[PDB]
XYZ file of C-alpha atoms in Angstrom:
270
model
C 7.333 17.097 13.843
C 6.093 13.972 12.418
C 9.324 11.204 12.295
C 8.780 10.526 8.833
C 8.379 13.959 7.799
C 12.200 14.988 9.658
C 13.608 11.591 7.706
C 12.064 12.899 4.703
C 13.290 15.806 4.850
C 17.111 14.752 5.710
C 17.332 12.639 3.099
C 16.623 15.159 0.454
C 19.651 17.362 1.768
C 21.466 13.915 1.940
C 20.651 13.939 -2.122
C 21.327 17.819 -3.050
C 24.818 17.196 -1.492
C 25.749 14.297 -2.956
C 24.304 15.296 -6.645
C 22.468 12.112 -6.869
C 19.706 10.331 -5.160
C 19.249 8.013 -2.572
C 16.587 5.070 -1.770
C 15.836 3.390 1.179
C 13.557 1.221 2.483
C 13.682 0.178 6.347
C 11.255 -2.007 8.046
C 10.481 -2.420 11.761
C 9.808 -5.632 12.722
C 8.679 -4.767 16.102
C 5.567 -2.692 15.265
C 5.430 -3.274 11.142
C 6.436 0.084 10.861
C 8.298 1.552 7.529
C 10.493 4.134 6.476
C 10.653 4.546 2.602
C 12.657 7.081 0.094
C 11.863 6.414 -3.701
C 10.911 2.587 -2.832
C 9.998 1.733 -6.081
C 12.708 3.182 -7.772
C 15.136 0.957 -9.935
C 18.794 0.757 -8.211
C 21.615 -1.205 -9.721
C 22.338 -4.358 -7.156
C 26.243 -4.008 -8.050
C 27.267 -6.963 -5.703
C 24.862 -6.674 -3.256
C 23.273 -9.450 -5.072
C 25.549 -11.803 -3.656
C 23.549 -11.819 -0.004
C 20.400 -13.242 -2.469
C 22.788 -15.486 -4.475
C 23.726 -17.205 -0.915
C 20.146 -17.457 0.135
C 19.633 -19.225 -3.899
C 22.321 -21.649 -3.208
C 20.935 -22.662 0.157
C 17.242 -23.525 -1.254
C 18.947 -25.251 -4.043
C 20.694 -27.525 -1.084
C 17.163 -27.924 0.941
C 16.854 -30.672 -2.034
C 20.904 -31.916 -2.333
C 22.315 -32.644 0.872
C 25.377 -32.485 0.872
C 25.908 -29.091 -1.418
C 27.479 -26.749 1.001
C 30.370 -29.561 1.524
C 30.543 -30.244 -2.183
C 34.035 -29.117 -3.552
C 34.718 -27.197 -6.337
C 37.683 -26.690 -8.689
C 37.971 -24.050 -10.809
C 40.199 -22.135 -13.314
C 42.785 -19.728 -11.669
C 44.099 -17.855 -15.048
C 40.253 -17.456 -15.586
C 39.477 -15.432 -12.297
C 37.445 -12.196 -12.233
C 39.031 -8.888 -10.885
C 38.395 -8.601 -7.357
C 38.961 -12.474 -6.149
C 41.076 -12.177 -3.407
C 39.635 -14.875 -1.390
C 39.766 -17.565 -4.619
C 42.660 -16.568 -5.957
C 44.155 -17.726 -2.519
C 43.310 -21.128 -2.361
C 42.328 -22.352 -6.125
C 45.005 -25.119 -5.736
C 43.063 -26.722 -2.863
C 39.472 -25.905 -4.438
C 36.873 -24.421 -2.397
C 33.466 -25.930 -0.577
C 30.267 -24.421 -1.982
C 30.458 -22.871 1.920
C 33.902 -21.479 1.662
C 32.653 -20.113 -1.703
C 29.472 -18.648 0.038
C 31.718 -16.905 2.905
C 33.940 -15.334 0.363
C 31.029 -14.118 -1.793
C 29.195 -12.428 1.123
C 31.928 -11.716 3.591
C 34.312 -9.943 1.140
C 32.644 -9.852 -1.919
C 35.103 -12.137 -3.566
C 33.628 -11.951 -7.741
C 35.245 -15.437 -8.392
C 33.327 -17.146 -5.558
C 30.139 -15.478 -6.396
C 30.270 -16.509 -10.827
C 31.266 -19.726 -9.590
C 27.907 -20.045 -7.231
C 26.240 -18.512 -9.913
C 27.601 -21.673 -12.141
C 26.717 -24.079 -9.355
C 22.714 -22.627 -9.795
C 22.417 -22.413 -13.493
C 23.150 -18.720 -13.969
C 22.219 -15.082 -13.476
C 18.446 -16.363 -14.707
C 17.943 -19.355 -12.516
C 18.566 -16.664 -9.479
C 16.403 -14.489 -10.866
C 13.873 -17.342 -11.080
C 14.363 -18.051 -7.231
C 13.854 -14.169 -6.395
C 10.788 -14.799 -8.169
C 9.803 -17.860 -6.657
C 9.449 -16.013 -3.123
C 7.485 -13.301 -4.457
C 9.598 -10.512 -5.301
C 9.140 -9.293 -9.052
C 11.757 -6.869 -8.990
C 15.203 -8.443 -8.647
C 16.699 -8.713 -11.843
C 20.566 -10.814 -12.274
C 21.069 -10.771 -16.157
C 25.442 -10.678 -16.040
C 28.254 -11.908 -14.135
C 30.853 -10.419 -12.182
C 31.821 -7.720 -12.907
C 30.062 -6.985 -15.468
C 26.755 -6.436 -13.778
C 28.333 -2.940 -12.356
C 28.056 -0.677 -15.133
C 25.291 1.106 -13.469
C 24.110 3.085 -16.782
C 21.406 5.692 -16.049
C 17.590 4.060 -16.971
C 19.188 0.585 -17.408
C 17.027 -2.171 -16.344
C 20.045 -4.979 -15.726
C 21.148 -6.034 -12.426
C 18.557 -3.764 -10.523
C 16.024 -4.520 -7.869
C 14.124 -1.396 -5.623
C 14.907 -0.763 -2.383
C 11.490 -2.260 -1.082
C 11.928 -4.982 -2.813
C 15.597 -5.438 -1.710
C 14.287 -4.923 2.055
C 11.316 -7.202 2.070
C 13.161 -9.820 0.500
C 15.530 -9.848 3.324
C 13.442 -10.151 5.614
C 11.492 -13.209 3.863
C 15.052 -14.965 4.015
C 17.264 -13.815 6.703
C 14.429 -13.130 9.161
C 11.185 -14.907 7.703
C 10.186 -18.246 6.209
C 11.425 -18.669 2.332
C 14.050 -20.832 3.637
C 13.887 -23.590 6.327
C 15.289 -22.853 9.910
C 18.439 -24.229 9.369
C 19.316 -22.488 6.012
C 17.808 -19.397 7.179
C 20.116 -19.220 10.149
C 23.176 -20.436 7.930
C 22.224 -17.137 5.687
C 22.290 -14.738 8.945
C 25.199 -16.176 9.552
C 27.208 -15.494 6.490
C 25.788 -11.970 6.459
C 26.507 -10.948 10.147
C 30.448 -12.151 9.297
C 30.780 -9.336 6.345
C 33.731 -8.117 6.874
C 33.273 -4.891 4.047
C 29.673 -2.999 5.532
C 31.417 -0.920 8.606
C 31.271 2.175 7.259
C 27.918 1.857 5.932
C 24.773 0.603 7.523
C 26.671 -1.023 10.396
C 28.383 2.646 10.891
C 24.329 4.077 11.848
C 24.006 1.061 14.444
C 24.684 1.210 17.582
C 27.942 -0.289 19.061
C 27.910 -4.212 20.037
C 24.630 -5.019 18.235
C 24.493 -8.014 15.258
C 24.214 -7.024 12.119
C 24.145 -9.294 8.899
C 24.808 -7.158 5.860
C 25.951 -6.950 2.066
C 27.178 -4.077 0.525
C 27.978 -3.253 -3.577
C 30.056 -0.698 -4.832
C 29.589 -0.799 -8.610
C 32.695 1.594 -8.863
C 31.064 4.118 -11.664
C 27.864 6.800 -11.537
C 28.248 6.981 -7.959
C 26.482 3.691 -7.310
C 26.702 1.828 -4.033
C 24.804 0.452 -1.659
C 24.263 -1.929 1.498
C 21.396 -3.675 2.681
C 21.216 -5.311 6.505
C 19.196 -7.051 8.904
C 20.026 -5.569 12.560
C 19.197 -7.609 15.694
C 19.050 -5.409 18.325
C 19.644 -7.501 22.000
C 16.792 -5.130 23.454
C 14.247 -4.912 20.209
C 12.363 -6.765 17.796
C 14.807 -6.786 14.170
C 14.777 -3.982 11.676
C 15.580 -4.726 8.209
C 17.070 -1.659 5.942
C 17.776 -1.411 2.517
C 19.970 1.818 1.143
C 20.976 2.168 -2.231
C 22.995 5.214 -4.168
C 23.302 6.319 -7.694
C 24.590 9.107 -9.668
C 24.270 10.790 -12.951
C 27.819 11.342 -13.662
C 29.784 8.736 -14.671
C 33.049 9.577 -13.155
C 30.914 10.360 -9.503
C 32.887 8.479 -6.981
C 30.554 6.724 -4.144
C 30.046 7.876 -0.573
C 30.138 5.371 2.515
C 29.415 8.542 4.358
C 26.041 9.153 2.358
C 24.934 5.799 2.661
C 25.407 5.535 6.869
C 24.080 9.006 6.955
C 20.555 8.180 4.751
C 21.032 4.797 7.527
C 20.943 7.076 10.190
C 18.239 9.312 8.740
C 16.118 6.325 8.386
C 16.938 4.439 12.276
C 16.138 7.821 13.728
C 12.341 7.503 12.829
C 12.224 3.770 14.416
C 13.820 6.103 17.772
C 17.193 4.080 17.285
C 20.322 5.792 17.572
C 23.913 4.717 17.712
């Protein structure tokens, strides 16, 4: 059978189980080759965002040296939910770094509205995403805000393709110069919250720079990676979940599964 067909087809039974549907986009480095399930489709970003919001605040210090060390201070009583890492140390301030390692290693919704300050807003990121060539990403709320995940809704959604290719322009590629790019890999191969989604498909030992979102509603989550294999060329894989009931809980399980489904056809398995 043809690789893409058997991926196909396991990824539909992936989506009659789990009552909703399920997109993915993985990318081969190696060879160019793709794996894709509803590409184009709109997914909300819930707080995977926060891997592009990193890669935003590093162009914006390719012209400000400096940034990355530049301290912040910032309200406490004003704190999102879900800012476990700020919360902690708001009487010493944070770096724009510190910030950055919060935001993408534990999703910490403080750090990230507070990066999201530091760039001029949920638009100016948006204008960056656009700036690389990717007309899909869409930031139009903060934290946490931007998780209502509301069937058809256009806010705070990107595609899986879209999600995947730009990844690889900025973890991988050349949107950001050598040093930035490598800080962003960095940050993303520290998350701390992605091991029982992509990272749960890969196998053991290998790096693996990833961001996951769990919007906490319509069963939509999601995680999106860049794997560097010791033995291969890098594969970049975007998968993203969503439901039609509103009280649908996510699945981790789902999401390494479609992961799986998707590695198999690029004859990795964990």
């Amino acid at each position: 059978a043809d690789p893409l067909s058997v991926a196909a087809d396991k990824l539909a039974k992936l989506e009659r189980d789990f009552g909703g549907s399920i997109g993915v986009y993985a990318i081969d480095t190696g060879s160019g080759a793709t794996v894709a399930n509803r590409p184009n489709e709109r997914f909300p970003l819930c707080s995977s965002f926060k891997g592009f919001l990193a890669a935003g605040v590093l162009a914006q210090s390719q012209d400000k040296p400096g940034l990355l060390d530049k301290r912040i201070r910032y309200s406490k009583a004003a704190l999102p939910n879900w800012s476990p890492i700020t919360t902690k140390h708001q009487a010493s301030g944070m770096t724009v770094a510190e910030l950055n390692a919060a935001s993408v290693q534990y999703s910490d919704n403080g750090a990230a509205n507070l990066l999201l300050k530091e760039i001029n807003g949920p638009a100016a990121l948006t204008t960056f995403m656009r700036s690389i060539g990717d007309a899909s990403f869409r930031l139009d709320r903060l934290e946490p805000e931007l998780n209502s995940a509301i069937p058809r809704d256009p806010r705070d959604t990107s595609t899986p393709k879209a999600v995947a290719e730009s990844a690889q322009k900025l973890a991988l590629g050349k949107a950001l110069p050598e040093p930035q790019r490598q800080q962003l890999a960095d940050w993303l191969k520290g998350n701390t919250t992605g091991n029982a989604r992509i990272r749960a498909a890969v196998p053991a030992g290998w790096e693996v720079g990833d961001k996951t979102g769990t919007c906490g509603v319509y069963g939509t989550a999601n995680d999106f990676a860049v794997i560097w294999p010791p033995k291969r060329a890098p594969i970049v894989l975007a998968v993203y979940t969503k439901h039609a009931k509103k009280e649908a809980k996510h699945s981790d399980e789902v999401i390494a599964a479609a992961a799986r489904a998707a590695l198999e056809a690029f004859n990795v398995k964990k």
